[PDB]
RNA sequence: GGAUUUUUGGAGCAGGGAGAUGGAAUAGGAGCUUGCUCCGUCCACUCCACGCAUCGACCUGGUAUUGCAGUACCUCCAGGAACGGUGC
């Protein structure tokens, strides 16, 4: 058991992640984790008005991860 | 250690299916990767949600935590799924 | 110690189960598993602001059950002895 | 190991309810407070109690409060939010 | 300073007046009496606080880990 | 003990109620430890929605009852 | 490949101020310096502050033991 | 070969092309449609094609009945209690029937949920102003004989015989 | 076998403001029926901030495609917005 998610093809690629409460971030993944935790370096989050705010390297847990869409062709 | 709906979802990889999330998002396309924990990774996917925002993306990945249901074709419901 | 062995020994008893959404299902408990899978026969379910409906069989999960209601003539002192 | 942790941790606050036969209150997530004597407990906070009194407040959908009594009931540990022990049986 | 693990910090916080706030907005302030390994809390002479206003005293209060959001040692 | 509660309703049409208020009426073919239901040629009522073979997860299941005779 | 546990250990060793967002709560977040961590992502913030984005206020609490089941996103700030 | 409970329990039931539960009761030559209580409203469509039913009546209360196939029959009269037994009846195929007068379409106006009606290959359709009378008597029907009802046809039906 | 993807739950609660606007056939209290006055529950219309923007389904008119396939959905233009959900 405890199989890690297949995130080897999405390594070092710019993807957009969706978090609970209607949150949207975009950034390049820098690693993987068996608990679905993603490290996004130089991430930019979308605000409510539509402006993008750069938050840098952030860590998103798997408990609030909704959907991750790869914006680059892998 | 592997369930029969998990085996039916793993055997249906490569067909035009859809996955409806708990928030209503329907990721439709060819199931490229289907793990044992309902992790659906699709290529050339399409987002048709309960919000209705229909778009086309190159690659999508929906985990089994927020996945509500999965709509699969009836090509694998005859054999070897007959028990 | 374990409440699953006490809940599994409560078969053939007319009890009630109230869910988290306000739906109350009253019926005779016929089957209880280790995951608290309550399989009842000839139950009556009343949802929130809805009419009660009678069903010949019902299967409620353990995670969806919020509270239970047992009759006053239930031997809880004798059933607690493992 | 398990018995010492149950008799020395927070579960001892449950174990004082069944040994001395005291009355405790349980506030659930449905805005309901049930006061009663805890008869059976477990590691997953499965509380089987007897002679419980549950009070809450409801709107017509001004609102108003209400209360009811049950002879014997059983509640799972998932819906139990707050558990308060107070000397109310004396 | 030195990196302290949360389990000796919770073991050493027993007997001190702290306040544990839940996800519903209500907080319980009192002396921490019991803290197990499953992040469960049992306090004595607890007082309830809602929206920055005190509600009343309850005594021994048991709060589980599924509902408690944060805890602050006063 | 016997664990025949889910095996007796195999290959039969059952209607499962979801947590959000939806009802899926389909032929239950197999199950698992996580209560994963596979409903072949299922209908969604809340209006009628053509779904077909719908594999609903066990986390969004509330109650299930018998709908009719097996086809 | 950068592990999240290694990034959390580097953030605890650097003692930088980080902001933690709550799960299903976008109005209020926390901010503080993480001193230690565990396997359940339990953060120990020293001189923490709860920032409400709706009211534009900040309330300090001090030593806070935040559980990992509520923290959804964590970002590093310069303040 | 009357319609009984043993004939309904031995009949085939499956999914149709519209993903609805349909029971194939064709090839039975039932003179009267009765004993439908054994299905217990578990079918969304009723396939009663190629039968000898004379009157479309005698049906119990079935809230799940939404489609009724009465093609290739000898139906010449409609029951007045069709709305009390099928409140959700939306599809009614009565092609190649024995309806001669428009007065048999008067109990069909009680079905408020009926939207698709087929009255082709019938002597009642060959009468003068049959489509206008069917549009005036049944305003809830949107598709009549595989044709969408327009606003001009509704105005012509509301103008005459007002 | 209660610590992130299933079973000891992060769930609960409330629908913006105003107007000498309108109704409780049989169901509010008080000034101790009826008539009148006051106050903590909806729907219809009007005004400010058609609550806002988004896409999907859908109706009218015009318009293009005549094509042999196993399907989230399928031409375009303009008007109206009865429906769904997303963020404030």
From Swiss-Prot, chain A:
One of the GO biological process terms: mRNA splicing, via spliceosome
GO cellular component, one term: U4 snRNP
GO molecular function: RNA binding
Keywords: Cytoplasm, mRNA processing, mRNA splicing, Nucleus, Ribonucleoprotein, RNA-binding, Spliceosome
Compartments, as annotated in UniProt: Cytoplasm, Cytosol; Nucleus
Sm domain boundaries: 2-74
Any Pfam family matching the protein: LSM
SUPFAM superfamilies assigned: Sm-like ribonucleoproteins (SSF50182)
Disulfide pairings: none
Gene3D superfamilies given in the database record: 2.30.30.100
InterPro entries per record: Lsm7/SmG-like (IPR044641), LSM_dom_sf (IPR010920), Sm (IPR047575), Sm_dom_euk/arc (IPR001163), Sm_G (IPR034098)
PANTHER family according to UniProt: SMALL NUCLEAR RIBONUCLEOPROTEIN (PTHR10553), SMALL NUCLEAR RIBONUCLEOPROTEIN G-RELATED (PTHR10553:SF26)
Family designation: Belongs to the snRNP Sm proteins family.
UniProt function note: Plays a role in pre-mRNA splicing as a core component of the spliceosomal U1, U2, U4 and U5 small nuclear ribonucleoproteins (snRNPs), the building blocks of the spliceosome. Component of both the pre-catalytic spliceosome B complex and activated spliceosome C complexes. As a component of the minor spliceosome, involved in the splicing of U12-type introns in pre-mRNAs. As part of the U7 snRNP it is involved in histone 3'-end processing.
Protein name, per record: Small nuclear ribonucleoprotein G
Organism expressing this protein natively: Homo sapiens (Human)
Name of the gene this protein is made from: SNRPG
Swiss-Prot record, chain D:
Domain Sm: from-to ranges: 11-89
UniProt gene name: SNRPD2
GO molecular function, one term: RNA binding
Functional note: Plays a role in pre-mRNA splicing as a core component of the spliceosomal U1, U2, U4 and U5 small nuclear ribonucleoproteins (snRNPs), the building blocks of the spliceosome. Component of both the pre-catalytic spliceosome B complex and activated spliceosome C complexes. As a component of the minor spliceosome, involved in the splicing of U12-type introns in pre-mRNAs.
Entry annotated with the keyword Transcription: no
Protein's cellular compartments: Cytoplasm, Cytosol; Nucleus
Residues of the full protein shown: 19 to 116 of 118
Keyword field: Acetylation, Cytoplasm, Isopeptide bond, mRNA processing, mRNA splicing, Nucleus, Phosphoprotein, Ribonucleoprotein, Spliceosome, Ubl conjugation
Superkingdom of origin organism: Eukaryota
Record's GO cellular component terms: catalytic step 2 spliceosome; cytosol; extracellular exosome; methylosome; nucleoplasm; nucleus; pICln-Sm protein complex; precatalytic spliceosome
GO BP term, example: 7-methylguanosine cap hypermethylation
Name of this protein: Small nuclear ribonucleoprotein Sm D2
Family listed: Belongs to the snRNP core protein family.
Something else known: In the autoimmune disease systemic lupus erythematosus, antinuclear antibodies are developed with Sm specificity.
Swiss-Prot record, chain F:
Domain of life according to the entry: Eukaryota
Protein location: Cytoplasm, Cytosol; Nucleus
Post-translational modification: Methylated by PRMT5.
Domain Sm: 1-70
Extra remark: Patients with the autoimmune disease systemic lupus erythematosus (SLE) have autoantibodies directed against some of the individual snRNP polypeptides. The most common autoantigen is called Sm. B/b' bear Sm epitopes.
Family, similarity comment: Belongs to the snRNP SmB/SmN family.
Assembly information from the UniProt record: Core component of the spliceosomal U1, U2, U4 and U5 small nuclear ribonucleoproteins (snRNPs), the building blocks of the spliceosome. Most spliceosomal snRNPs contain a common set of Sm proteins, SNRPB, SNRPD1, SNRPD2, SNRPD3, SNRPE, SNRPF and SNRPG that assemble in a heptameric protein ring on the Sm site of the small nuclear RNA to form the core snRNP. Component of the U1 snRNP. The U1 snRNP is composed of the U1 snRNA and the 7 core Sm proteins SNRPB, SNRPD1, SNRPD2, SNRPD3, SNRPE, SNRPF and SNRPG, and at least three U1 snRNP-specific proteins SNRNP70/U1-70K, SNRPA/U1-A and SNRPC/U1-C.
Disease / disorder: Cerebrocostomandibular syndrome: A syndrome characterized by severe micrognathia, rib defects ranging from a few dorsal rib segments to complete absence of ossification, and intellectual disability.
Protein name: Small nuclear ribonucleoprotein-associated proteins B and B'
Organism (species): Homo sapiens
Phylogenetic classification of the source organism: Eukaryota, Metazoa, Chordata, Craniata, Vertebrata
Residues of the full protein shown: 4 to 87 of 240
UniProtKB/Swiss-Prot annotation, chain G:
GO biological process: 7-methylguanosine cap hypermethylation; mRNA splicing, via spliceosome; spliceosomal complex assembly; spliceosomal snRNP assembly; U2-type prespliceosome assembly
A Pfam family matched in the record: LSM
Miscellaneous notes: Patients with systemic lupus erythematosus produce antibodies which interact with snRNP proteins.
Main location: cytoplasm
Outcome, altering residue 32 to S: In HYPT11; does not affect subcellular localization
Family per record: Belongs to the snRNP Sm proteins family.
Job description of the protein: Plays a role in pre-mRNA splicing as a core component of the spliceosomal U1, U2, U4 and U5 small nuclear ribonucleoproteins (snRNPs), the building blocks of the spliceosome. Component of both the pre-catalytic spliceosome B complex and activated spliceosome C complexes. As a component of the minor spliceosome, involved in the splicing of U12-type introns in pre-mRNAs. As part of the U7 snRNP it is involved in histone 3'-end processing.
SMART domains with a match to the protein in the record: Sm
Record key words, sorted: Cytoplasm, Disease variant, Hypotrichosis, mRNA processing, mRNA splicing, Nucleus, Ribonucleoprotein, RNA-binding, Spliceosome
Protein name (Swiss-Prot/TrEMBL): Small nuclear ribonucleoprotein E
Tagged with keyword RNA-binding: yes
